[PDB]
Amino acid sequence: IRQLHYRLRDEQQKSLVLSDPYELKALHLNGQNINQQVIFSMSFVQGEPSNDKIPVALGLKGKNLYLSCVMKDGTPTLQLESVDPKQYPKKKMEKRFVFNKIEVKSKVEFESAEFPNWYISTSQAEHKPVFLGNNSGQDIIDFTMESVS
Template identity: 45%
Template sequence: MAQVPEINSILMDNYSETEEDLYGGSPRGIKNSVQDFHWGSCPKNCSTCSSGITLEITEQRQSSRTFRKTVVLVVAVEKMKKKTDSRKLFTDMDLLDLLNNIFVEDEIPFETFEFEHSSNKTYRYSTSKVFNIKDTSNKCFALQEFPGNARLVALQLQGMNIQREVKLNMAFYSTQPFDGGRKRPVALGIMGKNVYLSCVSAEGAPELRLESVRNIQSIKNDDLLRFIFLKSENSPNSNSTSSFESAVFPDWYISTSQSEAELVRMVQQHEQRYITEFSLFKDM
């Protein structure tokens, strides 16, 4: 059975009266090699070595936290040198603020966006109807065509000239969400032609234009908006008139002039020189 060596024999074998011998060859006076501490290879052949016990001693590593604390203290001292005014005393609050700056957690980057969200209406095609249209002065819409261009004018048409009268192919739309108002979204096309009325901005003011459209139903909501006019009826009886307000430019209406053969255009409702009320007659 192996015997545990006496402590005194171990201490005496490694004892030295001089400090150089005690710490020579190792920072702590202890050798790191396992072979140097294997009692079987000891040249003194002492009783402890013959016990067959192998002793291994390892150095304790310095904690990384201790090093980190040291770095923090060095940084704190340097900041105190730069921030502390020599003319006033360094208080506890100064030390607290300094430590808070050192031990602050890493800031998480973020971005703040400010925006206003509005629920845009979605227009869905419902049905189409054909109408004859006249303003309150009994003027009809007529189309004047030029090479690469066309315009809509209001004329008094009689006799054979009545064939020049423009009929409107009125496409009705529903909205999502439903607003429940009395204004009905419509798109106004020229019957027999792939041309629709649109309202766009030109030189800072709304302008009525004629645009070529193959199929109004295929146009998506964003591009459709300039073709949408809000039709409202101004009286409930059989002689009711309708007005057409631009969906893009509120308070701007399709109008005709009091004069003959003038362009159909967009005006604001308070313009008394123009007519914004129209009678519609369903085409048979």
């Protein structure tokens, strides 16, 4: 299926990067460093409520890794999950892979379809991993989407 490539930067202008083999971190990168950041691949998912948000799946470009949400250790958790390079991406992704892209201004927010009210969020500090938060204080849930290719 068609997959649009983008790069995300939280509202504080922090670019996202892949560090631990299966972990995303957000930090401040200048124009000389905005090339080492992750390019996501967004595709539409047919198991949709629509509502007013667009359901999408977010994988990393070129890799068989997708962001998914799971109930782990008594708390919803964002995780980078590997999948069969043959079956993915599929038109009707499993619910844990689904995010509802919501647009407010020029900012986008990604709510977990599985865990409503939980968003892909970043902390105020640098080098902290991107997580599934619920929007509280030092939690940045608004992102900018730069179209890559």
